[PDB]
Amino acid sequence: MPNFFIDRPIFAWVIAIIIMLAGGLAILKLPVAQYPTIAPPAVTISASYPGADAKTVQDTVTQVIEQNMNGIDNLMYMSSNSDSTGTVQITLTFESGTDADIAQVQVQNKLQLAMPLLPQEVQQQGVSVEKSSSSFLMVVGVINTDGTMTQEDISDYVAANMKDAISRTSGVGDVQLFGSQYAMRIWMNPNELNKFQLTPVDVITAIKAQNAQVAAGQLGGTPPVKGQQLNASIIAQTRLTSTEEFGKILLKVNQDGSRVLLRDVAKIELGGENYDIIAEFNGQPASGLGIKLATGANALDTAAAIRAELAKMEPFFPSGLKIVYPYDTTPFVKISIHEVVKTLVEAIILVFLVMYLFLQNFRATLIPTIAVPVVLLGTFAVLAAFGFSINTLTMFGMVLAIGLLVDDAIVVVENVERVMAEEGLPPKEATRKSMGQIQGALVGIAMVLSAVFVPMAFFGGSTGAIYRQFSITIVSAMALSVLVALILTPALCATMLKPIAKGDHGEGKKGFFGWFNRMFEKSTHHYTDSVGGILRSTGRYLVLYLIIVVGMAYLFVRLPSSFLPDEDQGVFMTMVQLPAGATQERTQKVLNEVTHYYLTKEKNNVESVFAFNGFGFAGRGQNTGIAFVSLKDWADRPGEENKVEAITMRATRAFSQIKDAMVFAFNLPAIVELGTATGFDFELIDQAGLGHEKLTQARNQLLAEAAKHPDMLTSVRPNGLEDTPQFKIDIDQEKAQALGVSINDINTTLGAAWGGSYVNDFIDRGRVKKVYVMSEAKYRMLPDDIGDWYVRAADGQMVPFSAFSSSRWEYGSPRLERYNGLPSMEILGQAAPGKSTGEAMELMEQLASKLPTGVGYDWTGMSYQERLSGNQAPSLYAISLIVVFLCLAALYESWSIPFSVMLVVPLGVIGALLAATFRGLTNDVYFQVGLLTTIGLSAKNAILIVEFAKDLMDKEGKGLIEATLDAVRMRLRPILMTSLAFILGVMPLVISTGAGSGAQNAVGTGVMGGMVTATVLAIFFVPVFFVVVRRR
Amino acid sequence: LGTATGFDFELIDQAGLGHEKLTQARNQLLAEAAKHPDMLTSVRPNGLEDTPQFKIDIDQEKAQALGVSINDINTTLGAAWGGSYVNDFIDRGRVKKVYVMSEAKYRMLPDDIGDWYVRAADGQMVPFSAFSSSRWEYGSPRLE
Amino acid sequence: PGADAKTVQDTVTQVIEQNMNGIDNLMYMSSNSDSTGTVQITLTFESGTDADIAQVQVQNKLQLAMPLLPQEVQQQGVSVEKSSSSFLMVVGVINT
Amino acid sequence: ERLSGNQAPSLYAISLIVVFLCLAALYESWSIPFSVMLVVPLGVIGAL
């Protein structure tokens, strides 16, 4: 093939232009995103029961739904929680690669077999079923700068004049609002209600009667009498539309003839669906949205498009309204885009300076300046053909292939330039001999480099998806690289290079260009003499190779293995956890303090604080909170003390003075949609009918026995909440019957007043919203306000709860959890420093086996991936060893000559571990994938050294040490040009600081140090291996 | 696809403006478009125009005073003049619906409302005139 | 049965519409509420969208409102068909 | 149409460029293609 295109230089230019057309076409239209879909796909059912205790939500919604979640494909596990805000969240998680669409449908179908069995109050609130494994594209906030709009008002406006437009933008798939649209709110007053002998039942009945949309038919409708001229609709009651209309609802006519109006017993006012979340932005009332990225959509397109949408609307907002953007991925996506290209461009210049230093002409330097572009651009068309996206993982999978894409251009031009200066052939025929010496080896270089990266695309779980991103990007660029080294680069070597005379080693040049050729010719002389002097006692230099193998193995087992490094993303979280019982008002104080501190002590780094008094991550509740700190650009936050980690430490430390509470800051894990990070994830399970209490006691035993082994387990803790005092009102059924009081009237008097009640709908500026009845806070705050409420008996008398009820305080759960349909408590922790997570697990399991009879366990989340993915690495890379072995035996037609190539692996890796352990890095995914590219070039250099030394024996009749010392001479200059352009091209990634430094340093330090050793040592060890093997 | 040629415009109430106002605003555009016949021909709406409607308003205070249920009133009216599906029956061994409606004779003119009575709690028959009142108004036969 | 255009919109259409979000490849949604008591809501999608997957997602979101629709409407059947096809033939039936 | 008006000048532009590269591929020349590429109007004019 190379010869076909040497003589057709335009046909090969046509093909390389089309690879660039198909690959440039592939960049414009392909989805950009920070990552792809790594998390196993989950479906969440969510349901609300206004006014319900955690037990009620579980015993009338959760369990019902759960008991119907079977007969579903690829279901890994199901966890659910039932809190005391009346909310139920059931997450069903599935096998990796399950169809997110098919899973949602099957769930929905089984859910809907229980909908008829759910309470009506729950049905009316909406039992939603979304796809939960995605994560936030951006976050809009909305403030009013005149300060004339409750969060209620702003939320309504956002609900009525923003939310849909954004959710109809091209590429959006989910939008969540930080509030509700307005709700007509009747705030009952019990003093009045008793005055006129009325309960909240009368109110609710009036509202449903006087706020109604009645269908009344038509005058002159089908079927018609003959001779009819009029056809008109009959119109009757229409839903009320104003607080004024609502207040004018007639509840009762007095005996004298006076009217009892709704406004006579309650306070009508537009308000919210619920008041559980106060969301302040820099301590101002706010609303906003939590947008999400659609499956396979261009983050850049969508994100920009919204910003232009909001922009389109800003003229028309009410006075004061201001849109804010306290989070966006778009900057960090443009950053990573900018960072990878500004590393591939400096790699074309660093190969320009490297090529020009040895080959000393600009004609040769234009072939790798042209060759890498093609393989880069055209890998995108091969990734598009396989449905991959432009993501940090695929983008850094292309800077990690530089060593292999650049060697594929150096080995073609250097061998052409070498055959011309040693034999004296013209450019057109020296390329034919140069490319005959590396035709079958390059096809063998690719079949081997397949069997190295491809077994990693078969890894399982979330990890196996991360690996499937590099594995296909690299293999794609490399299969396109080896094809570019057989179509375009020999056509280029044959028409752009000028002749060199036989023997001219540039030793007759003056200036700086004379000195280097005379110092390198002797440097070639001194090296080939070393290899000789090394050959003398190869039995000595095989004993030193075993020190590299125990030094690596010793280094492999002491280097800690992480997942993916934490970046500074301009944003981070602080959690506020007041204790059990703490009113919203208290939690606000602490929250206002968190915002204050961030707006003074860190004014230079802090851009904004989005304070959410209502929900944390332990749960929702009046005692929890989350503050969202958005930092200024990384440009205005220079240094270490002005980057997230530093700021969080300062924070955690500064807040420890807070006495009546728990305030912690921390940083967002890299993959937000997985959290993971490290540690383990334990579930304690009531596998008999034991009970909440007993499961708690049993959870206690484990928590105490775990705190007595701090050597292995640190931070062993629960994730759920602790029992809280509750007020129980017990109805004496016999006393109620005796007085003529309905249990249903009693029950709704109580829950309507203290819990709230959705009654029906109304029209508010021509949109349908809900109407709710609740007591005005005055009479629903203390256990003694129950004496203010009365319930009307059949004889028509008003009766106080004290006449049929009694009360007492008790304890109960504010958050009942269930794991795979059984009661559970989820325990979180981490391995004490030094030990591995896996052995920490075995301790937990041992500890748990001791816990009382009935109490099972299991592992979820992370701990379920690893327990399902630990045996993969030794058996998949075993297959890798075997297939590359069969690829090398295929290239050298020998079951033994492969081994000489197969013995180069440690030489790079040892240096990679070294460079890693020195700097303070970890065995993370960027390390392991950088190892497979470091091994890929150190063995491709061994393939061309063993091919050049076995070709000298096979078709020229040279001896053993002759062919070895002759081949290592030919293959010296290319190994040096490659590894110099690759250590210097990777250098700015090793000294990389600021935005994106986790991913740059994790590839940089592992590739720079593993390339120092895969070139300095290999050159001395790959001739030894070829001799010890060829002689054995 | 229909398509053929021309254009397809949607005028949208992007505040809580109202049916009427959106209509007026639609009118302005339709008139200003008929003053440029050089560019735009046949500029027109696709929906329908407001039609007179008969509104029966129930005096809740008068109904309560007489002991007449709003639900009884409401279904007396809609069952009679609108129709009502009640339940199913078997017709030659297949299940079909059962509907109740007034015979056209008494559901054709606004004056046939005086023929309909609603029974109060005391057990008396009460005409709509004793708790209702009516008037003609305009409304949309097709809200888009 | 028996409803004025306003009633059909304020008790059926808007309810259903307010639940038609979180759906893939949705181009636009138009709907009409007439005085025959009928409601038609057309959701149109990107070209090449899966006619099966689109129907399912709609149905799923529709059904989160079914509990909030009037009983008179539920009993009549809230159907969800694929509307972009066209007539193969038309049979008529007379008695001579 | 508001979502499909820019397509024709840029898609047939790609068409010009790829056939140009196909003709340069057949005659091994970056200039001999143009002699083939200049026949388009001769038919089209008659079609109009």
Side-chain angles (χ1 to χ4, degrees), chain A residues 105 108 112 124 127 131 163 173 181 213 215-218 235 238-239 767-768, chain C residues 2-4 6-7 10-11 14 18 20-22 24 35 56 60 63-64 68:
Chain A
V105 185
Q108 261 263 33
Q112 257 283 334
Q124 292 157 356
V127 178
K131 296 183 286 192
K163 171 156 179 292
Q181 66 190 354
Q213 203 70 38
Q218 283 166 13
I235 299 298
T238 265
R239 293 182 183 174
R767 181 182 161 103
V768 74
Chain C
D4 41 293
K6 183 146 134 188
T7 298
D10 301 353
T11 81
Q14 297 200 48
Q18 287 191 10
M20 298 303 310
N21 44 44
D24 305 347
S35 58
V56 185
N60 285 10
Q63 257 283 334
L64 307 183
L68 283 327

mmCIF file of all heavy atoms in Angstrom, chain A residues 105 108 112 124 127 131 163 173 181 213 215-218 235 238-239 767-768, chain C residues 2-4 6-7 10-11 14 18 20-22 24 35 56 60 63-64 68:
data_model
loop_
_atom_site.group_PDB
_atom_site.id
_atom_site.type_symbol
_atom_site.label_atom_id
_atom_site.label_comp_id
_atom_site.label_asym_id
_atom_site.label_seq_id
_atom_site.Cartn_x
_atom_site.Cartn_y
_atom_site.Cartn_z
ATOM 1 N N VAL A 105 -39.973 2.931 31.638
ATOM 2 C CA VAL A 105 -41.283 2.420 31.252
ATOM 3 C C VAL A 105 -41.707 1.271 32.153
ATOM 4 O O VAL A 105 -42.844 1.224 32.625
ATOM 5 C CB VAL A 105 -41.274 1.997 29.775
ATOM 6 C CG1 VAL A 105 -42.659 1.580 29.342
ATOM 7 C CG2 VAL A 105 -40.792 3.139 28.929
ATOM 8 N N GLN A 108 -42.658 2.658 35.745
ATOM 9 C CA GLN A 108 -43.947 3.317 35.574
ATOM 10 C C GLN A 108 -45.092 2.328 35.488
ATOM 11 O O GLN A 108 -46.115 2.480 36.158
ATOM 12 C CB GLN A 108 -43.923 4.185 34.315
ATOM 13 C CG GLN A 108 -43.678 5.665 34.605
ATOM 14 C CD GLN A 108 -44.956 6.516 34.663
ATOM 15 O OE1 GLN A 108 -46.014 6.050 35.091
ATOM 16 N NE2 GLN A 108 -44.837 7.788 34.279
ATOM 17 N N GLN A 112 -47.813 2.061 38.429
ATOM 18 C CA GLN A 112 -49.250 2.300 38.113
ATOM 19 C C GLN A 112 -50.172 1.144 38.500
ATOM 20 O O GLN A 112 -51.389 1.307 38.364
ATOM 21 C CB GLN A 112 -49.407 2.560 36.618
ATOM 22 C CG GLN A 112 -49.605 4.027 36.280
ATOM 23 C CD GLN A 112 -51.011 4.483 36.582
ATOM 24 O OE1 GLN A 112 -51.953 3.693 36.588
ATOM 25 N NE2 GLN A 112 -51.164 5.773 36.832
ATOM 26 N N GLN A 124 -53.363 13.078 44.082
ATOM 27 C CA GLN A 124 -53.626 14.464 43.621
ATOM 28 C C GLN A 124 -52.344 15.301 43.563
ATOM 29 O O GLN A 124 -52.350 16.318 42.861
ATOM 30 C CB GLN A 124 -54.651 15.119 44.545
ATOM 31 C CG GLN A 124 -56.041 14.517 44.449
ATOM 32 C CD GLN A 124 -56.826 14.781 45.708
ATOM 33 O OE1 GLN A 124 -56.316 15.348 46.671
ATOM 34 N NE2 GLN A 124 -58.081 14.368 45.709
ATOM 35 N N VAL A 127 -47.540 11.495 41.372
ATOM 36 C CA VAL A 127 -46.527 10.497 41.659
ATOM 37 C C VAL A 127 -45.621 10.465 40.426
ATOM 38 O O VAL A 127 -45.885 9.754 39.455
ATOM 39 C CB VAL A 127 -47.158 9.143 41.970
ATOM 40 C CG1 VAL A 127 -46.089 8.100 42.231
ATOM 41 C CG2 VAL A 127 -48.118 9.241 43.153
ATOM 42 N N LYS A 131 -35.845 9.996 35.402
ATOM 43 C CA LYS A 131 -34.526 9.365 35.270
ATOM 44 C C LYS A 131 -33.499 10.153 36.086
ATOM 45 O O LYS A 131 -33.155 11.283 35.729
ATOM 46 C CB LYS A 131 -34.112 9.299 33.801
ATOM 47 C CG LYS A 131 -35.011 8.424 32.923
ATOM 48 C CD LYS A 131 -34.501 8.328 31.477
ATOM 49 C CE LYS A 131 -34.765 9.640 30.718
ATOM 50 N NZ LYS A 131 -34.576 9.560 29.225
ATOM 51 N N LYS A 163 -40.044 28.982 33.188
ATOM 52 C CA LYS A 163 -39.642 27.579 33.333
ATOM 53 C C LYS A 163 -39.888 26.799 32.038
ATOM 54 O O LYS A 163 -39.070 25.949 31.665
ATOM 55 C CB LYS A 163 -40.371 26.927 34.487
ATOM 56 C CG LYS A 163 -40.135 25.422 34.525
ATOM 57 C CD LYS A 163 -40.334 24.863 35.904
ATOM 58 C CE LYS A 163 -40.134 23.350 35.948
ATOM 59 N NZ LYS A 163 -41.167 22.573 35.233
ATOM 60 N N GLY A 173 -33.423 18.535 29.181
ATOM 61 C CA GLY A 173 -34.190 17.341 29.460
ATOM 62 C C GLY A 173 -34.872 17.321 30.814
ATOM 63 O O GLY A 173 -35.749 16.483 31.063
ATOM 64 N N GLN A 181 -45.311 27.623 41.747
ATOM 65 C CA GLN A 181 -46.218 28.680 41.344
ATOM 66 C C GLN A 181 -47.129 29.040 42.506
ATOM 67 O O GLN A 181 -47.236 28.297 43.477
ATOM 68 C CB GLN A 181 -47.078 28.259 40.188
ATOM 69 C CG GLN A 181 -48.038 27.170 40.518
ATOM 70 C CD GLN A 181 -48.656 26.659 39.247
ATOM 71 O OE1 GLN A 181 -48.424 27.225 38.169
ATOM 72 N NE2 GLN A 181 -49.369 25.556 39.340
ATOM 73 N N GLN A 213 -66.003 24.504 38.320
ATOM 74 C CA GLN A 213 -66.206 24.716 36.867
ATOM 75 C C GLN A 213 -67.296 23.739 36.449
ATOM 76 O O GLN A 213 -66.997 22.550 36.327
ATOM 77 C CB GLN A 213 -64.915 24.500 36.088
ATOM 78 C CG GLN A 213 -64.886 25.217 34.750
ATOM 79 C CD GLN A 213 -64.784 26.712 34.912
ATOM 80 O OE1 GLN A 213 -64.086 27.216 35.786
ATOM 81 N NE2 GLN A 213 -65.484 27.434 34.054
ATOM 82 N N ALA A 215 -70.087 22.012 33.979
ATOM 83 C CA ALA A 215 -70.510 21.807 32.582
ATOM 84 C C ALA A 215 -72.038 21.836 32.568
ATOM 85 O O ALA A 215 -72.635 21.048 33.310
ATOM 86 C CB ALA A 215 -69.964 20.500 32.094
ATOM 87 N N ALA A 216 -72.647 22.696 31.751
ATOM 88 C CA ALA A 216 -74.116 22.869 31.818
ATOM 89 C C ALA A 216 -74.788 22.645 30.465
ATOM 90 O O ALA A 216 -75.986 22.915 30.359
ATOM 91 C CB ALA A 216 -74.398 24.245 32.338
ATOM 92 N N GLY A 217 -74.043 22.186 29.471
ATOM 93 C CA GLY A 217 -74.660 21.847 28.180
ATOM 94 C C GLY A 217 -74.858 23.027 27.255
ATOM 95 O O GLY A 217 -74.181 24.048 27.434
ATOM 96 N N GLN A 218 -75.766 22.878 26.294
ATOM 97 C CA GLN A 218 -75.985 23.931 25.283
ATOM 98 C C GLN A 218 -77.480 24.122 25.053
ATOM 99 O O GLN A 218 -78.233 23.176 25.311
ATOM 100 C CB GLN A 218 -75.365 23.489 23.962
ATOM 101 C CG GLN A 218 -73.856 23.616 23.896
ATOM 102 C CD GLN A 218 -73.341 22.842 22.712
ATOM 103 O OE1 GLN A 218 -74.101 22.438 21.837
ATOM 104 N NE2 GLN A 218 -72.038 22.620 22.678
ATOM 105 N N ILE A 235 -73.682 28.477 30.326
ATOM 106 C CA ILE A 235 -72.505 28.700 31.199
ATOM 107 C C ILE A 235 -73.009 28.815 32.632
ATOM 108 O O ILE A 235 -74.021 29.488 32.850
ATOM 109 C CB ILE A 235 -71.721 29.943 30.735
ATOM 110 C CG1 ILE A 235 -71.194 29.777 29.309
ATOM 111 C CG2 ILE A 235 -70.601 30.280 31.706
ATOM 112 C CD1 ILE A 235 -70.217 28.643 29.152
ATOM 113 N N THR A 238 -68.018 29.322 37.321
ATOM 114 C CA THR A 238 -66.649 29.312 36.767
ATOM 115 C C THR A 238 -65.715 29.413 37.972
ATOM 116 O O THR A 238 -66.116 30.029 38.966
ATOM 117 C CB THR A 238 -66.486 30.422 35.725
ATOM 118 O OG1 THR A 238 -66.721 29.841 34.443
ATOM 119 C CG2 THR A 238 -65.123 31.076 35.738
ATOM 120 N N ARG A 239 -64.545 28.788 37.897
ATOM 121 C CA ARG A 239 -63.611 28.779 39.049
ATOM 122 C C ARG A 239 -63.268 30.220 39.429
ATOM 123 O O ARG A 239 -63.068 31.038 38.525
ATOM 124 C CB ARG A 239 -62.379 27.929 38.719
ATOM 125 C CG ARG A 239 -62.669 26.446 38.560
ATOM 126 C CD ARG A 239 -61.421 25.639 38.283
ATOM 127 N NE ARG A 239 -61.716 24.234 38.064
ATOM 128 C CZ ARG A 239 -60.816 23.334 37.691
ATOM 129 N NH1 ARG A 239 -59.553 23.477 38.048
ATOM 130 N NH2 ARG A 239 -61.181 22.298 36.958
ATOM 131 N N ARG A 767 -54.143 31.011 34.526
ATOM 132 C CA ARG A 767 -53.416 29.759 34.688
ATOM 133 C C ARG A 767 -53.959 29.031 35.921
ATOM 134 O O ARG A 767 -54.355 29.670 36.916
ATOM 135 C CB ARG A 767 -51.943 30.044 34.815
ATOM 136 C CG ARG A 767 -51.056 28.831 34.964
ATOM 137 C CD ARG A 767 -49.650 29.273 35.114
ATOM 138 N NE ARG A 767 -48.828 28.232 35.698
ATOM 139 C CZ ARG A 767 -47.991 27.482 34.997
ATOM 140 N NH1 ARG A 767 -47.830 27.658 33.699
ATOM 141 N NH2 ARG A 767 -47.335 26.503 35.602
ATOM 142 N N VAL A 768 -53.997 27.691 35.846
ATOM 143 C CA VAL A 768 -54.583 26.884 36.921
ATOM 144 C C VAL A 768 -53.547 26.559 38.002
ATOM 145 O O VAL A 768 -52.426 26.135 37.716
ATOM 146 C CB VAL A 768 -55.272 25.607 36.368
ATOM 147 C CG1 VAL A 768 -54.283 24.539 35.929
ATOM 148 C CG2 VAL A 768 -56.064 24.945 37.478
ATOM 149 N N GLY C 2 -70.902 17.936 27.749
ATOM 150 C CA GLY C 2 -71.655 19.073 28.255
ATOM 151 C C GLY C 2 -70.845 20.287 28.664
ATOM 152 O O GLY C 2 -71.387 21.178 29.326
ATOM 153 N N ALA C 3 -69.571 20.309 28.295
ATOM 154 C CA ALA C 3 -68.689 21.362 28.832
ATOM 155 C C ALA C 3 -68.413 22.501 27.856
ATOM 156 O O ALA C 3 -68.263 22.236 26.656
ATOM 157 C CB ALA C 3 -67.403 20.722 29.266
ATOM 158 N N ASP C 4 -68.311 23.714 28.396
ATOM 159 C CA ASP C 4 -67.978 24.897 27.577
ATOM 160 C C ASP C 4 -66.477 24.913 27.336
ATOM 161 O O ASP C 4 -65.736 24.403 28.176
ATOM 162 C CB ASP C 4 -68.380 26.183 28.288
ATOM 163 C CG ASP C 4 -68.065 26.175 29.768
ATOM 164 O OD1 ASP C 4 -68.694 25.383 30.487
ATOM 165 O OD2 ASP C 4 -67.190 26.951 30.183
ATOM 166 N N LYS C 6 -64.278 26.857 27.948
ATOM 167 C CA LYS C 6 -63.424 27.285 29.087
ATOM 168 C C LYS C 6 -63.265 26.124 30.062
ATOM 169 O O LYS C 6 -62.128 25.842 30.457
ATOM 170 C CB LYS C 6 -64.054 28.465 29.824
ATOM 171 C CG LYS C 6 -63.242 29.034 30.975
ATOM 172 C CD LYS C 6 -63.410 30.526 31.116
ATOM 173 C CE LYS C 6 -63.657 30.965 32.542
ATOM 174 N NZ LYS C 6 -63.997 32.404 32.619
ATOM 175 N N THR C 7 -64.372 25.472 30.408
ATOM 176 C CA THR C 7 -64.347 24.348 31.372
ATOM 177 C C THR C 7 -63.381 23.281 30.863
ATOM 178 O O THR C 7 -62.595 22.777 31.661
ATOM 179 C CB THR C 7 -65.771 23.838 31.606
ATOM 180 O OG1 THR C 7 -66.515 24.912 32.175
ATOM 181 C CG2 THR C 7 -65.833 22.633 32.518
ATOM 182 N N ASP C 10 -59.847 24.683 31.441
ATOM 183 C CA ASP C 10 -59.420 24.947 32.834
ATOM 184 C C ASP C 10 -59.560 23.697 33.705
ATOM 185 O O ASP C 10 -59.083 23.741 34.843
ATOM 186 C CB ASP C 10 -60.153 26.178 33.366
ATOM 187 C CG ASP C 10 -59.887 27.428 32.546
ATOM 188 O OD1 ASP C 10 -59.027 27.367 31.652
ATOM 189 O OD2 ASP C 10 -60.541 28.451 32.812
ATOM 190 N N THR C 11 -60.197 22.629 33.219
ATOM 191 C CA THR C 11 -60.198 21.429 34.039
ATOM 192 C C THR C 11 -59.584 20.239 33.341
ATOM 193 O O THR C 11 -59.208 19.288 34.044
ATOM 194 C CB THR C 11 -61.597 21.023 34.558
ATOM 195 O OG1 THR C 11 -62.302 20.322 33.544
ATOM 196 C CG2 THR C 11 -62.413 22.181 35.045
ATOM 197 N N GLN C 14 -55.198 22.441 30.441
ATOM 198 C CA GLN C 14 -54.073 23.023 31.211
ATOM 199 C C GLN C 14 -53.483 21.974 32.152
ATOM 200 O O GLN C 14 -52.259 21.849 32.181
ATOM 201 C CB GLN C 14 -54.557 24.253 31.968
ATOM 202 C CG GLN C 14 -55.029 25.371 31.058
ATOM 203 C CD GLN C 14 -55.028 26.689 31.787
ATOM 204 O OE1 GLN C 14 -54.056 27.053 32.441
ATOM 205 N NE2 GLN C 14 -56.130 27.412 31.684
ATOM 206 N N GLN C 18 -49.624 21.139 31.858
ATOM 207 C CA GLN C 18 -48.678 21.435 32.926
ATOM 208 C C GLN C 18 -47.847 20.213 33.311
ATOM 209 O O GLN C 18 -46.879 20.345 34.059
ATOM 210 C CB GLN C 18 -49.409 22.013 34.143
ATOM 211 C CG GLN C 18 -49.887 23.450 33.955
ATOM 212 C CD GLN C 18 -50.379 24.155 35.251
ATOM 213 O OE1 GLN C 18 -50.199 23.652 36.349
ATOM 214 N NE2 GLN C 18 -51.022 25.321 35.101
ATOM 215 N N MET C 20 -46.600 18.052 30.791
ATOM 216 C CA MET C 20 -45.938 17.606 29.566
ATOM 217 C C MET C 20 -44.548 18.213 29.481
ATOM 218 O O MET C 20 -44.246 19.034 28.628
ATOM 219 C CB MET C 20 -46.753 17.992 28.348
ATOM 220 C CG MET C 20 -48.100 17.380 28.297
ATOM 221 S SD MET C 20 -48.095 15.599 28.369
ATOM 222 C CE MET C 20 -46.898 15.161 27.134
ATOM 223 N N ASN C 21 -43.705 17.825 30.420
ATOM 224 C CA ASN C 21 -42.327 18.254 30.391
ATOM 225 C C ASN C 21 -41.463 17.091 30.845
ATOM 226 O O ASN C 21 -41.940 16.145 31.487
ATOM 227 C CB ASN C 21 -42.103 19.506 31.255
ATOM 228 C CG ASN C 21 -42.791 19.428 32.608
ATOM 229 O OD1 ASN C 21 -42.749 18.396 33.287
ATOM 230 N ND2 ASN C 21 -43.376 20.539 33.035
ATOM 231 N N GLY C 22 -40.178 17.171 30.498
ATOM 232 C CA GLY C 22 -39.280 16.063 30.760
ATOM 233 C C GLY C 22 -39.499 14.984 29.724
ATOM 234 O O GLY C 22 -39.638 13.797 30.042
ATOM 235 N N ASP C 24 -38.263 13.799 25.630
ATOM 236 C CA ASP C 24 -37.152 13.933 24.702
ATOM 237 C C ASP C 24 -37.625 14.299 23.305
ATOM 238 O O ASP C 24 -38.601 13.739 22.798
ATOM 239 C CB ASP C 24 -36.360 12.631 24.648
ATOM 240 C CG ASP C 24 -35.898 12.190 26.010
ATOM 241 O OD1 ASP C 24 -35.978 13.009 26.950
ATOM 242 O OD2 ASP C 24 -35.467 11.020 26.147
ATOM 243 N N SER C 35 -66.132 23.819 22.294
ATOM 244 C CA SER C 35 -67.381 23.894 23.030
ATOM 245 C C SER C 35 -68.276 22.693 22.796
ATOM 246 O O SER C 35 -69.406 22.677 23.296
ATOM 247 C CB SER C 35 -68.094 25.179 22.647
ATOM 248 O OG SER C 35 -68.271 25.131 21.231
ATOM 249 N N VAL C 56 -44.914 6.585 24.390
ATOM 250 C CA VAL C 56 -44.782 6.086 25.754
ATOM 251 C C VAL C 56 -44.507 7.223 26.725
ATOM 252 O O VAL C 56 -45.120 7.305 27.792
ATOM 253 C CB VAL C 56 -43.680 5.017 25.823
ATOM 254 C CG1 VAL C 56 -43.623 4.415 27.208
ATOM 255 C CG2 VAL C 56 -43.956 3.947 24.808
ATOM 256 N N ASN C 60 -46.981 8.391 29.764
ATOM 257 C CA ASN C 60 -46.506 8.383 31.139
ATOM 258 C C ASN C 60 -46.771 9.721 31.827
ATOM 259 O O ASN C 60 -47.233 9.749 32.971
ATOM 260 C CB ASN C 60 -45.019 8.006 31.164
ATOM 261 C CG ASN C 60 -44.783 6.489 30.919
ATOM 262 O OD1 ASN C 60 -45.704 5.739 30.544
ATOM 263 N ND2 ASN C 60 -43.536 6.045 31.123
ATOM 264 N N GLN C 63 -50.554 10.393 32.266
ATOM 265 C CA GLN C 63 -51.085 9.592 33.405
ATOM 266 C C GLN C 63 -50.715 10.145 34.780
ATOM 267 O O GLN C 63 -51.203 9.596 35.774
ATOM 268 C CB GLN C 63 -50.564 8.160 33.309
ATOM 269 C CG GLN C 63 -51.598 7.178 32.786
ATOM 270 C CD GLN C 63 -52.608 6.817 33.847
ATOM 271 O OE1 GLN C 63 -52.332 6.883 35.043
ATOM 272 N NE2 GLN C 63 -53.794 6.425 33.413
ATOM 273 N N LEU C 64 -49.892 11.178 34.844
ATOM 274 C CA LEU C 64 -49.609 11.786 36.165
ATOM 275 C C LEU C 64 -50.670 12.848 36.428
ATOM 276 O O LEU C 64 -50.628 13.472 37.499
ATOM 277 C CB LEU C 64 -48.218 12.422 36.139
ATOM 278 C CG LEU C 64 -47.085 11.501 35.692
ATOM 279 C CD1 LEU C 64 -45.748 12.217 35.790
ATOM 280 C CD2 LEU C 64 -47.067 10.217 36.508
ATOM 281 N N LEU C 68 -56.105 13.860 38.313
ATOM 282 C CA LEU C 68 -56.483 15.275 38.565
ATOM 283 C C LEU C 68 -57.524 15.719 37.539
ATOM 284 O O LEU C 68 -57.979 16.865 37.626
ATOM 285 C CB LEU C 68 -55.222 16.136 38.466
ATOM 286 C CG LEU C 68 -54.276 16.084 39.662
ATOM 287 C CD1 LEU C 68 -55.048 15.881 40.953
ATOM 288 C CD2 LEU C 68 -53.230 14.997 39.479
#
